[PDB]
Design a protein around this nucleic acid. Structure first.
Lengths: 180, 50, 46, 104
DNA sequence: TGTAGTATAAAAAC
DNA sequence: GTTTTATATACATACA
């Protein structure tokens, strides 16, 4: 096709290599929340790249919301520097992208029921529960959410090419079940 | 920057956020703004973090 | 404004009257308590 | 069991300064000033709860926010504050410090 | 009565 | 159970 999924969210993990006192981090970093009754981590945000980090006492960190691999790593380095500047022996090790989410629009309605029946082992469609058809693709290993509108969500990728190949594989099927 | 007067001092009942849109329901406070003071039973804050 | 000026007057009058017992327990002075009240209102006015 | 945050208000700062002056003149001891401030903490809390009726609306850009130890702190920039009991006030920068209405 | 929060449905860290 | 993000339905709850 001439349609390429748009990347929407990238989640990555980073190991800072030192234990952290979360209250100290929250008291010295701007835009930080530390509520141990809610979640054992400091939740911090930066405007650029626009992301949210979950920072743990173990020094492990999760960075979410980036739209490109470059932004994911840059944002992660920025959080590491903030922690370093507060006074912790934080390093930037084992950066790893864990999940990439993409979306696209084929611009034509889909007969979800007929699609689910024909691809029963990969499909889950209970419209009264959730309006999208949940398609679990084997190769590449990607989960797609297919809607009547023709809008598609693709998730579970470790690299962007998996999002692209999953859409290419599903396109013929979507066309096969186009509405009216 | 990243590391750590008109001042409002009060209590919060609820703080919520959707995307970058924050809403805070505050109560029992006092605030000095532009050199004048105001006391209040309730206050609602709607601010965008952008 | 009316509400704020009013709240401040309530606070000052209530604090002064409520700490008279602590003041007396420390054997301070009624005139000293009145001085606290006046310096406080003065600095508030400033 | 009352928050000390109001000591930072205009009325609170004035009381602190007044107490400090009497201490400096050797008229009262710091121990009494502490009891006076503790009473102030309670009186302000009760007065703001029972003797206010106005409602304010604050709208603007959220510059910074933070939460730690049951306290939310926000810095709002270029905001408009509406006071109702017809008055719209504009502020370049407003710092908001809020303690949990549910105390621990 | 038409405008404007909850619930439902990959991955890591705790 | 948090956090992020595209997507879309039903149902709740305010308010002029």
């Amino acid at each position: 096709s001439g349609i390429v999924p748009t990347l929407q969210n990238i989640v990555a993990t980073v190991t800072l290599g030192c234990r952290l006192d979360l209250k100290t981090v929250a008291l010295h970093a701007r835009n930080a929340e530390y509520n141990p009754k809610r979640f054992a981590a400091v939740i911090m945000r930066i405007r650029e790249p626009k992301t949210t980090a979950l920072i743990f006492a173990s020094g492990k960190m999760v960075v979410t919301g980036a739209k490109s691999e470059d932004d994911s790593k840059l944002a992660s380095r920025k959080y590491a520097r903030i922690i370093q500047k507060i006074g912790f022996a934080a390093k930037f090790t084992d950066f790893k992208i864990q999940n990439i989410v993409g979306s696209c629009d084929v611009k034509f309605p889909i007969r979800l029921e007929g699609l689910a029946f024909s691809h029963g082992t990969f499909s889950s469609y209970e419209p009264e529960l959730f309006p999208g058809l949940i398609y679990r693709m084997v190769k590449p290993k990607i989960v797609l959410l297919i809607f009547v509108s023709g809008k598609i969500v693709l998730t579970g990728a470790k690299q962007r090419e998996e999002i692209y190949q999953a859409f290419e594989a599903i396109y013929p099927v979507l066309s096969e079940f186009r509405k009216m | 920057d990243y590391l750590i007067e008109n001042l409002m001092l009060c209590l919060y009942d609820k703080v919520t956020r959707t995307k970058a849109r924050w809403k805070c329901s505050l109560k029992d406070g006092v605030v000095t703004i532009n050199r004048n003071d105001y006391t209040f039973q309730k206050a609602q804050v709607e601010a965008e973090w952008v | 404004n009316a509400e704020a000026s009013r709240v401040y007057e309530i606070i000052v009058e209530s604090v002064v009257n409520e700490v008279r017992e602590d003041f007396e327990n420390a054997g301070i002075d009624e005139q000293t308590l009145q001085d606290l009240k006046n310096i406080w209102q003065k600095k508030l006015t400033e | 069991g009352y928050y000390e945050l109001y000591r930072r208000s205009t009325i609170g700062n004035s009381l602190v300064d007044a107490l400090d002056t009497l201490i400096s003149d050797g008229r009262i001891e710091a121990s009494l000033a502490m009891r006076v401030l503790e009473t102030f903490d309670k009186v302000v809390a009760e007065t703001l709860k029972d003797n206010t009726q106005s409602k304010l609306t604050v709208k603007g850009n959220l510059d910074t926010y933070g939460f730690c130890d049951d306290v939310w702190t926000f810095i709002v920039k270029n905001c408009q504050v509406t006071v109702e009991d017809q008055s719209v006030i504009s502020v370049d920068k407003l710092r908001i410090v809020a303690c949990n209405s549910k105390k621990s």
